Structures are given as C-alpha cells and as structure tokens.
C-alpha cells in the first residue's frame, strides 16, 4: 500500500527538514503538492518528474532543439532493447 516519495530540491528552492515520507498510493497527487506548499510557503512552485519522449521522425530538428535543446546542442539517446 505504501510508496516512498523522495522530495529533491532543485534550482535554488529551499531544502526540507524531512526529504522522504511513505504515502498510500491511492491518494491524488494534489496531496503531495499541497504538502510541499505547506512546508515551503513559496508563491511559485514547479513540481516535475523525469520522463522519456520519443519524437515523430517527421519533426524538424529545430523545433526539437527549441523544446529540449540548450547552447546549440541537443542530447538524443538511442537503445536497441527496452
């Protein structure tokens, strides 16, 4: 029933006194977000997770770079099994 949530502070956001907690997986994610804001008391807050993204081959390399590029570079990964 329990999943352990690590709350990792990025990009100048404050570090929390308790970085991890166990939470029942049936609650809505809002619970987690509201809980952050309660502890931070910060107007702005972004909450995001890493993810993979498989672009359509018909997509122009520029539009990709605009979205997932920096410094005139994009890092594209490839695999043969997954």
Partner 1 sequence: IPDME
CB nearer partner 1, residue 11 or residue 25: 25
Instruction: Tell me: does residue 18 bind its own copies (CB under 8 A).
Output: no
Is the dihedral angle over the CA atoms 8, 34, 52, 71 positive or is it negative? negative
Residue 2: C-alpha distances to residues 18, 21, 22, 31 (Å): 17, 10, 6, 14
Instruction: Tell me: does residue 31 bind partner 1 (CB under 8 A).
Output: yes
Q: Token pair of 4, please?
A: 């352990």
Judged by CB under 8 A, which of 35, 40, 64, 69 binds partner 1?
35
Contact footprint for its own copies (CB under 8 A): 1-14, 23-33, 36, 40, 42, 44-62, 64-65, 67-70, 72-82
């Amino acid at each position: 029933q329990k999943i352990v949530v690590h709350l990792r502070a990025t990009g100048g956001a404050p570090i929390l006194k308790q970085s991890k907690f166990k939470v029942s997986g049936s609650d809505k994610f809002a619970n987690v977000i509201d809980f952050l804001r309660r502890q931070l008391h910060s107007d702005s807050l972004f909450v995001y997770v890493n993810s993979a993204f498989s672009p359509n081959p018909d997509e122009s390399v520029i539009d990709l770079y605009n979205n997932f590029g920096f410094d005139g570079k994009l890092v594209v990964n490839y695999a043969c099994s997954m």
